[PDB]
């Protein structure tokens, strides 16, 4: 009577949006990375009374639909209108929300695998949905599909579940370390990214490496203005401890690097000295959960 | 200094709505008449100060953009983001809103072209951006189009301006007759517009003339339901005075009819007589129009 599902969360290196009117048809290029650490949904559903409620909480406090617009527009799609009870849906998040994390697409398709799961349904029109609600409301392109492939995806081919082409880099003892910082709050980078980004692309296909995308991935930051000094600042000073380097957090304020157990421990050291927060999640190889909540 | 724009209204005979997540390709397949009664558009705008600001009212009275969401969309392109000054944009019906005579889309499009004509565009781009706020904004999907194609109007392509294909009948001697009750506020008619709509055109296009759209109507607006018993009643009253069946103003709780000058002031008696509301406009056969307001 209690589904939990998890996505992992999802941090895109570089990118190239395809916006487009149909939601299906509409998603990014890309590369990203998706780590142990991410968004658990849990839906509570309990049939009875003579009315159909849908509830939805983040981190144990109750959310308006305004702020959770996303989750409502799934759960309404897939709690039947005739349906008679009352559903929950309690997201619990490991990473702030607005910083480049992806915790609506955890939030929209972890809800749309419980529902689905307990509604009935499948995997790929639960996550054609969670990809829908996501760029209907502005909620991400490359998140929902990103988490999907799991590990080191790359976006070669923009479109949704079903629709669009993901492939999968291979690599080795390597762990995310992560600088969480912020949120972000000009037509000039538009085309600084259609441009540096389908170029990385291109050149990663050359070289299928993760190696080779923290390098792609830190060029095109700068090569189109969006990484902040700030943050360059404090890449400059890692990077000097990492045999990769770090890059920022795609639309969020932060930085990210892959980096094995031995540069970790001495970029811990190098970061908790500047006053500065960090995590550490594992690369999530596998693909998101669903199932009845056993432990 | 002062642009107005006017737009028919538009009233559907029947219909079979094509829903398309691309607003482009999106619309309907159906008749209908267009009015020499309809919208009357008014763009005031004045440069200076160091803000942009829009503003929209409806029959004199200001109206608050969560009211107005459709012609603000609109203007919000069309109003360059870097302008420096006052947008007013006054709107005045000749029929009320939600009755079926297409408001929302004589608004929209009246904005897009009397501030395109201001701020620069065509007619295409102005008629498309329209079509595509009504499409988003759940408006409508053939008053725009049909509105452009004037007079006794026919979509046969599905689709928005510059995509979509209507067509236009002939008619002699013929005038609008409207019985406007009020508003309307289940999956059995979706199936039955699918089929009755897609028949009646098809029938039309067998038959190309008035007098077989108005019959082609009266049966749609029965043989799906939508039509309200209480309008069937005024009808199968009206009908006695008319050469051609009045049939339901599709999505609004009225009637319509084609009539002569000589069975028209026949209907005006039965209809006072029933202590009913009436309303004559012409066909208008023209196209939109826009320019510089100088009477
Ligand atoms: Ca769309
Ligand atoms: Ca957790
Ligand atoms: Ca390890
Ligand atoms: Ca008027
Ligand atoms: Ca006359
Ligand atoms: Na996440
Ligand atoms: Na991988
Ligand atoms: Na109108
Ligand atoms: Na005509």
């Known amino acids: 009577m209690l589904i939990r599902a998890f996505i992992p969360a999802h941090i895109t290196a570089f990118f190239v949006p395809v916006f487009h009117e149909e939601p299906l048809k509409a998603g990014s290029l890309g590369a990203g990375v998706n780590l142990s650490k991410g968004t658990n949904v849990f839906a509570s559903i309990e049939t009875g009374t003579l009315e159909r409620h849908i509830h939805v909480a983040f981190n144990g406090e109750p959310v308006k639909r305004e702020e959770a617009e996303i989750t409502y527009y799934v759960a309404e799609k897939l709690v039947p ?18 910083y480049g994390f992806g915790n609506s697409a955890g939030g929209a398709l972890g809800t749309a695998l419980a529902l689905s799961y307990a509604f009935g349904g499948t995997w790929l029109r639960a996550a054609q949905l969670a990809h829908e609600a996501e760029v209907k409301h502005k909620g991400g392109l490359g998140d929902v599909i990103g988490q999907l492939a799991g590990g080191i995806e ?18 080795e003892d390597y762990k995310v370390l992560v600088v969480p910082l912020g949120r972000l709050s000009d037509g000039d980078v538009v085309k600084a990214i259609e441009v540096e980004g389908r170029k990385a692309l291109e050149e990663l296909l050359k070289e299928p ?5 923290m390098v792609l991935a830190r060029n095109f930051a700068e090569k ?4 902040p000094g700030e943050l360059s600042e404090i890449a400059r000073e890692l990077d000097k401890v990492l045999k990769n380097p770090s890059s920022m957090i795609m639309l969020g304020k932060g930085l990210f690097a892959l980096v094995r ?22 690369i999530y190889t596998e693909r998101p959960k669903v199932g009845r909540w056993v432990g």
Do not use: C, H
């Open 81 to 98: 209108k005739d349906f008679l009870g009352e559903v929950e849906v309690w997201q619990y998040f490991d990473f702030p929300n607005g």
């Open 154 to 171: 790359v976006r070669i081919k923009p479109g949704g579940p079903g629709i669009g082409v993901t492939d999968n880099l291979f690599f």
């Open 209 to 213: 490496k993760p190696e080779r995308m």
């Open 224 to 227: 189109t203005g969006l990484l």
């Open 261 to 282: 157990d031995e540069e970790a421990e001495k970029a811990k050291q190098l970061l908790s000295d500047m006053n500065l927060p960090y995590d550490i999640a594992e």
